Amino acid sequence: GTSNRDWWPNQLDLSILHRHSSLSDPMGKDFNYAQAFEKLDLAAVKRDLHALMTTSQDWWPADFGHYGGLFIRMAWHSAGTYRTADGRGGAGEGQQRFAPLNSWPDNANLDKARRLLWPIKQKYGRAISWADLLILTGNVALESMGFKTFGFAGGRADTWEPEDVYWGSEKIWLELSGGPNSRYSGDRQLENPLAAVQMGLIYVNPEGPDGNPDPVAAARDIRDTFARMAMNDEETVALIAGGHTFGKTHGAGPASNVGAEPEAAGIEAQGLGWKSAYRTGKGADAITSGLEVTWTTTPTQWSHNFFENLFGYEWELTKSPAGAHQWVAKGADAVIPDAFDPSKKHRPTMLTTDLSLRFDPAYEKISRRFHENPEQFADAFARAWFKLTHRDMGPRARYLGPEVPAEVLLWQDPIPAVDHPLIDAADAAELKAKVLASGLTVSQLVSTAWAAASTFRGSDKRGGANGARIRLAPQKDWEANQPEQLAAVLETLEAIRTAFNGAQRGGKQVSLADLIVLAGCAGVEQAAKNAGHAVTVPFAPGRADASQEQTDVESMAVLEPVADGFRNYLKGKYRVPAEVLLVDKAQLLTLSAPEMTVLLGGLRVLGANVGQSRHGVFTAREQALTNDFFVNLLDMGTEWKPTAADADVFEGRDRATGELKWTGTRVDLVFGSHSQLRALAEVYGSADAQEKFVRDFVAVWNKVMNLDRFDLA
Amino acid sequence: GTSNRDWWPNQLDLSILHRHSSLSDPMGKDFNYAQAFEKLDLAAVKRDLHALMTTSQDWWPADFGHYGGLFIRMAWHSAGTYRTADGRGGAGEGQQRFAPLNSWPDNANLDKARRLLWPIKQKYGRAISWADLLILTGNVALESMGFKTFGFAGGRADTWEPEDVYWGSEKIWLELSGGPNSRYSGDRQLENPLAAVQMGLIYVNPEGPDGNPDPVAAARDIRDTFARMAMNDEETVALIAGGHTFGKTHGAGPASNVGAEPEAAGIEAQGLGWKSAYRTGKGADAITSGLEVTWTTTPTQWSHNFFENLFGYEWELTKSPAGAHQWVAKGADAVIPDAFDPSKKHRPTMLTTDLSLRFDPAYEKISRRFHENPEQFADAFARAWFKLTHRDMGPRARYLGPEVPAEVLLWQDPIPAVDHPLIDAADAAELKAKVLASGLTVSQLVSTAWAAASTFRGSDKRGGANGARIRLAPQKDWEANQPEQLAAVLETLEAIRTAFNGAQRGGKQVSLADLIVLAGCAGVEQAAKNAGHAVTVPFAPGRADASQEQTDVESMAVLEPVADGFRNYLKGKYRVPAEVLLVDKAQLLTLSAPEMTVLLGGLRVLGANVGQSRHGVFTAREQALTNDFFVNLLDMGTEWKPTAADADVFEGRDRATGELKWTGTRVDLVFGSHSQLRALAEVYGSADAQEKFVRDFVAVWNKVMNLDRFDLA
Numbered sequence A, B: 001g002t003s004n005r006d007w008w009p010n011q012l013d014l015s016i017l018h019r020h021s022s023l024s025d026p027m028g029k030d031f032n033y034a035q036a037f038e039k040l041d042l043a044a045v046k047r048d049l050h051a052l053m054t055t056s057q058d059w060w061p062a063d064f065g066h067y068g069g070l071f072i073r074m075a076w077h078s079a080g081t082y083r084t085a086d087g088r089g090g091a092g093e094g095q096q097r098f099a100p101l102n103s104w105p106d107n108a109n110l111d112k113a114r115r116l117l118w119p120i121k122q123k124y125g126r127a128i129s130w131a132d133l134l135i136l137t138g139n140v141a142l143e144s145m146g147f148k149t150f151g152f153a154g155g156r157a158d159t160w161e162p163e164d165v166y167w168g169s170e171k172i173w174l175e176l177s178g179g180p181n182s183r184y185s186g187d188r189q190l191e192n193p194l195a196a197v198q199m200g201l202i203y204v205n206p207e208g209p210d211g212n213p214d215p216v217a218a219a220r221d222i223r224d225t226f227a228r229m230a231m232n233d234e235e236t237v238a239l240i241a242g243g244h245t246f247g248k249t250h251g252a253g254p255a256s257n258v259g260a261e262p263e264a265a266g267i268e269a270q271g272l273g274w275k276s277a278y279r280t281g282k283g284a285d286a287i288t289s290g291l292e293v294t295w296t297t298t299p300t301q302w303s304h305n306f307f308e309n310l311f312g313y314e315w316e317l318t319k320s321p322a323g324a325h326q327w328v329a330k331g332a333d334a335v336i337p338d339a340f341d342p343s344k345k346h347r348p349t350m351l352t353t354d355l356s357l358r359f360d361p362a363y364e365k366i367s368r369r370f371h372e373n374p375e376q377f378a379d380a381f382a383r384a385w386f387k388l389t390h391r392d393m394g395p396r397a398r399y400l401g402p403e404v405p406a407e408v409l410l411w412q413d414p415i416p417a418v419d420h421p422l423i424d425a426a427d428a429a430e431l432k433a434k435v436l437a438s439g440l441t442v443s444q445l446v447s448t449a450w451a452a453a454s455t456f457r458g459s460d461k462r463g464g465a466n467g468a469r470i471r472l473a474p475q476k477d478w479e480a481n482q483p484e485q486l487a488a489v490l491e492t493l494e495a496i497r498t499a500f501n502g503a504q505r506g507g508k509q510v511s512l513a514d515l516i517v518l519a520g521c522a523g524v525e526q527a528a529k530n531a532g533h534a535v536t537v538p539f540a541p542g543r544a545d546a547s548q549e550q551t552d553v554e555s556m557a558v559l560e561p562v563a564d565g566f567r568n569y570l571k572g573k574y575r576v577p578a579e580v581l582l583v584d585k586a587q588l589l590t591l592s593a594p595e596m597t598v599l600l601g602g603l604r605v606l607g608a609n610v611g612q613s614r615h616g617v618f619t620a621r622e623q624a625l626t627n628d629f630f631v632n633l634l635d636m637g638t639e640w641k642p643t644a645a646d647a648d649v650f651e652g653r654d655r656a657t658g659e660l661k662w663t664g665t666r667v668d669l670v671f672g673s674h675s676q677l678r679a680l681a682e683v684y685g686s687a688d689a690q691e692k693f694v695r696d697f698v699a700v701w702n703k704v705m706n707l708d709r710f711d712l713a
């Protein structure tokens, strides 16, 4: 059946903005997962999980009689898809249970792991999501095998369909680099936003880069992909060594015995995949990655044996039974237990990527320190496991349950608690009047608030106006934020704030974070008055101001907008068309296509463009809140053509005289070209639509201002 | 960017069930198009359209100074996508303005026609939909040129995204038959549900079949395609000759001058396409189809000159300036006006498909009658043009406005007016108890109500339980409806009805249509009571009973369910997997994926399967409304394998003993295989889900019962 995507494979796809509708969700519109979870008996769930660990099922027998290793890997993979570039991936939406991740080759036999958890899921129902369950299970595995975890938070609501994530352009699973859709160029430069070295891998290739078993070269891939997952060297060594203290790999026979992945299997497989024709197909005969490595002498107990083995032997390159490259300890005795036969032992073995931890010079120093000081290794692994499994959960306000760690961590982008009375509606009116009397313009007020609030992304719930981090490094220096203009607005608002705060009694005070947002609201109100409309814009106080020392400057760098179509901004020339970048940003902001449309049209006429660019400013009454963008964009009296100097800028001329009326970018004109977008533009550019435009704009503006407000949720 | 569709091109697509979310709709959740329309000043809209017809725009100059012909073709193409097989296509959703229809080759330059209408659309805003305006414009064209239309109804609400329609499997526009994805097999048998001869055509090829200019053979394709759009021979001749009384074709130069269709065009084209490098690219130089034919001596006035020319001349095969086959009158004078140069005239010309009307023997008889009696022609055309443009609008209750024709037409599947008081809540309770006391079983009551209500399809809003057409030919004899069992249930309910109606005062009575649905409600309540749950199923009276004489038996044939996964029914062996046919039925029913899942799981345990098949009946308490379908389907203690006799039937055996527990079809087991469906089955198969299952089942049952109830809108 030929589809629009077949005919026009480069047209923009808006269906990413209308995922996650109430149509696909089986839960009622009022379901609130936080409330369900807070009534869960978490202790009962953990007892059931502890029981499960050693309750072997014959259809996927437990190695060493204990599923802990399999579950740790399951959780680590759940979390391990995360990319700091866009925040997408991670454990936080339980997407391991949907395509494509349920069928990635690196996720082989994690279908079995999830199936073992069905009876617990069924027992507790809506009170524990799959997303929370996967992580909780990892934690229980660790605790069952003697490792004390740093804590656990619930609150990852389940999702009901696959996320639209760019995982790469390759058309072959696991394709090595340098092909027609290579994710690598230059000196092994991985394309943003990717965080894995081959299509269908979590981070790196366990044999080495593109299969080449060189631990030093593998270390480079480890370091880059883990940095792209928000992990530094210490955290990386702690995680890999900690993980590989447990369990084993599976490669008992040739890979060609392994059948279809779950999304390709037959209906009778009932959601499972990788059925193997090798011997019994399971247990002692299991084939998962094709490697056959058992790291420690006690694979079901926390030990300091990983680093004893890594440093205590010299290693020789060998092959598993499936033909994969791995390493065996020279001259060692058979000290490693077998997973099924008590009369068998094995020599110590390692992956290429384990040896990276010894042969990369920067890892070797950390590895040695951990070998010499195992308490340091335990604490670092516990912290890094927490970070790994919570990195995408957002502000601490979203953490639920009785095991949330009290300690505030820098990676959480923490916001200080509010400890004083908040401004009321009378105070808000008085502060908006002060802001309007200061001489700040609609353009400056709107731009500043937009800059502050539109750093939010729903993918990992980072960013937003809470914290007033716009005033700190590095946000205050981002080019899209217009640093010199921003400084002048912030100095004015800070003087207003100091004067209001110094006049108060009690402990009442306003944060700069709230004032930035409030001042934006005053700008929108003033713009509406400029247009002859009487509008009050909703405002909710309670933001607090974070400090510089609570703001990790290197972690904040990924939130920098290099493309922000809402301000007609593009930092450089990219291979992705700017209107695709617009849709991508709207998805991060949680906007639908009508919301994106309305917002952008209003921002253009309010003066939100970076550098006061006239591109898309299709009005003769700038700083007034009108639907002029749409009415002028749709006027057939204007003809558009790309300019000779720049194929991405367009000139709109009167059709009868040739006279220049406007200029616009791709982001501007897509609203008059894309057949669905133009349908939405038409609604707002109709003669009956001015009051609808204003009200819809105010609603979307408010939505953006509140995106990070989980304190109010 | 590689997508799930790329990796698993044959996995089932559920996104067709989640279109049309409130996310994608710019109108508020409360917007009611009927209420907006009813306040439109339709007379003022028509005066503006009348003025437009002769107000030429220089970017697409009006042929003969009059846009009437262009707009008639626009409206005909809007309606002309309709197929009776599934009800999809047609004018009723305004889909001509979205992909792919906006860029079909047969729709070339209708982009210009729609653009001409933007000012009027903009003026009237939400009070007139694009979908209504397309049709209205064609009526006003006809009226302005001297043709009296049969009437006009508003009420086609606009849609905001493309419909998911199977338009064929060809990967090349206009591909000739006999390719690798041929829509023809056997002796020129067009595959259901298609109703056009080539990908991107409305009906047929105007040169002849696969380009062969033989009028006799073209007639065969005309007759088949028009029958598949619900038009008979009389209506077909009236439509084609009526349309071709007006306007002209456009083929002034070679087709290679014409550039990309709108979905492929550059962003600067602002939604238009087919930009032509031939001379001025428009007006006298226009190229649309490649043909260059002007049918009558007065292209901007209704006449009987099409048939005068068709019968008054002999025709010679010739070529247009673009090289297309077309026909010219032998020895004729230059009597046809030129569209732009008043000093030039041309000979009469015809399409191959026009000559069909004279050279096919059955058409010739109708065409002669019309030639001899042009008042007969005018009436037939007016009736057919109304039918064409309203055939997908649904029940007459959805018609709006002051020009709705009072005459009731058989094709409308009409329902008599109700002229008596309706039963009240107490009456309904009395009837449900009488039905339960009669000895009819849950299975009989559920199955009968399902059979009556589930003929509805949202594509053309035909079918449903209103009318009680289940008691008439042909529904009473459809195999899926179990004709002997149905007859027994209907005799019982009719006796209950006669006894209740005979006892009443004041003219209160209950229709059989209402009682069928109420009896089904009683069944569902009783099933719930069987499970230990007291529920009342909502019921809304006001259905009426249609007569056999008000039911067109041949038209009703396309509503027969040959595949109804909800009753585990497949009439024959198809090349499309049954699970695909389930999702297609769910889309026709207007169900989401959660609604489809709940509904199916409940129907299985209520006894709704055709023939009392045990497939999917995963319960030991049949006729009790429980979630047993899901809890048993998801039980990992059962292993499933295809049977040796039939690969589409599966046995579920206990994994440990081998004992046979269940059998199921692909429609049953898709819910335990598809990763999105299984996530939905999990919610209903959880230990906390019995109350939720019952409530959601009752809600979707009631939705299905009410699908045709536009009297309550």
Ligand code: HEM
Pocket (backbone or CB within 6 Å): A063, A068, A069, A070, A071, A072, A073, A076, A203, A204, A205, A206, A222, A239, A240, A242, A243, A244, A246, A247, A248, A249, A250, A251, A287, A288, A289, A290, A291, A353
């Ligand atoms: C460079 C990073 C890493 C690489 C290349 C990697 C590679 C793999 C491979 C290939 C397997 C074998 C899969 C199979 O055949 O069953 C595996 C197993 C496993 N990994 Fe990793 N790993 C990495 C990091 C992690 C981290 C960060 C953790 C957790 C903190 C983890 C925990 C596990 C555990 C527990 C297993 C054993 C599974 C079982 O017992 O069934 N690994 N690893």
Ligand code: HEM
Pocket (backbone or CB within 6 Å): B063, B068, B069, B070, B071, B072, B073, B076, B203, B204, B205, B206, B222, B239, B240, B242, B243, B244, B246, B247, B248, B249, B250, B251, B287, B288, B289, B290, B291, B353
């Ligand atoms: C066998 C069925 C049909 C065939 C093959 C067919 C074919 C065509 C083609 C090839 C053109 C020229 C497109 C262009 O070059 O501008 C056209 C024009 C047109 N057709 Fe048809 N047609 C059919 C039926 C109908 C029907 C049912 C009607 C309406 C009742 C209709 C009304 C018109 C009108 C009014 C025009 C002139 C458009 C103009 O003036 O711009 N046709 N036809």
Ligand SMILES: OC[C@H]1O[C@H](O[C@H]2[C@H](O)[C@@H](O)[C@@H](O)O[C@@H]2CO)[C@H](O)[C@@H](O)[C@@H]1O
Pocket (backbone or CB within 6 Å): A471, A472, A491, A494, A547, A548
């Ligand atoms: O984090 C330290 C400090 O950074 C900024 O310093 C400001 C100053 O407070 C402003 O009011 C204005 O004069 O510009 C300075 C330029 O560096 C923050 O604005 C401030 O809240 C924070 O304490």
Ligand SMILES: OC[C@H]1O[C@H](O[C@H]2[C@H](O)[C@@H](O)[C@@H](O)O[C@@H]2CO)[C@H](O)[C@@H](O)[C@@H]1O
Pocket (backbone or CB within 6 Å): B471, B486, B487, B488, B490, B491, B492, B494, B495, B512
């Ligand atoms: O059985 C189908 C049939 O049922 C009802 O008609 C009754 C009729 O009213 C009685 O006289 C009875 O003894 O015979 C029929 C039952 O066969 C439906 O209302 C009717 O339209 C339908 O044919």
Ligand SMILES: [Cl-]
Pocket (backbone or CB within 6 Å): A088, A089, A090, A093, A095, A163, A164, A165
């Ligand atoms: Cl994601």
Ligand SMILES: [Cl-]
Pocket (backbone or CB within 6 Å): B088, B089, B090, B093, B095, B163, B164, B165
């Ligand atoms: Cl459709």
Ligand code: NA
Pocket (backbone or CB within 6 Å): A087, A088, A089, A090, A092, A392, A458, A459, A460
């Ligand atoms: Na994420």
Ligand code: NA
Pocket (backbone or CB within 6 Å): B087, B088, B089, B090, B092, B392, B458, B459, B460
């Ligand atoms: Na339709």
